[PDB]
Ligand binder design. Structure first.
Ligand SMILES: CCOc1ccc(Cl)c2c1[B@-]1(O[C@@H]3[C@H](O1)[C@@H](COP(=O)([O-])[O-])O[C@H]3n1cnc3c(N)ncnc31)O[C@@H]2CN
Length: 190
């Protein structure tokens, strides 16, 4: 595994990933609904042109987050066995320097890992499903499959990943951790 920091564009969000090699394909972040940084990161207003699917029908991000927390409390074990809300704010992907939107979603569990994930819809089917439901970008960074039909979860060759390009998955995992450590923004972890 690895832990990595994503800076708030406007605070650091630590994610745990078993696929640090896919960092150039991380197109959004997802925090557990109960994550301690959520209230900090919530924007006062929706950005202009926000996708209505992202707002939970709330007039402001704060109202939407409060409603999401209240609603998911009405779920049972049956439901818990993809929904979410945009916080109105962005983090910076440390690999490509690009802004990525921050969500909460109940598919991310508060007391596991760091309680936050980087979402890589190209290569994690859970993220693929969420991205399709919300209209988020799906980017291929591991050649081998067909991301238009499903997440590609296997081994392959790095693409669209700058200094990782051409590497195998195991080689790319080592390279990106090296880069994270040189920048002081992540670590390999068991
Ligand atoms: C299992 C396959 O995981 C994959 C597979 C492919 C890819 Cl590209 C990735 C991941 B992985 O998603 C995180 C983390 O890595 C992985 C940790 O799962 P393991 O059971 O602890 O090994 O699950 C996810 N995870 C970490 N903390 C979590 C939490 N609190 N709640 C829900 N899921 C969490 O990162 C990427 C981008 N999503």
């Amino acid at each position: 595994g690895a832990v990595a920091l994503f800076s708030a564009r406007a605070v650091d969000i630590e994610v745990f990933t078993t696929r640090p090699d896919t960092l150039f394909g991380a197109t959004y972040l997802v925090l557990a609904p109960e994550h301690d940084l959520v209230d900090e990161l919530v924007a006062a207003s929706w950005p202009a042109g926000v996708n209505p699917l992202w707002t939970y029908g709330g007039g402001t991000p704060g109202e939407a987050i409060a409603a999401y927390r209240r609603a998911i409390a009405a779920k049972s074990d049956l439901e818990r066995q993809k929904t979410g809300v945009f916080l109105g704010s962005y983090a910076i992907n440390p690999a490509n320097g690009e802004p990525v939107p921050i969500f909460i979603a109940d598919y991310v569990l508060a007391g596991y890992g760091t309680g936050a994930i980087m979402a890589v819809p190209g290569h994690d089917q859970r993220d693929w499903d969420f991205a399709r439901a919300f209209g988020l970008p799906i980017v291929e960074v591991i050649a081998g499959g067909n991301i238009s039909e499903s997440a590609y979860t296997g081994d392959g060759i790095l693409v669209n990943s700058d200094y990782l390009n051409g590497m195998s998955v195991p080689a790319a995992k080592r390279a990106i951790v090296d880069r994270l450590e040189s920048a002081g923004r992540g670590r390999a972890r068991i």
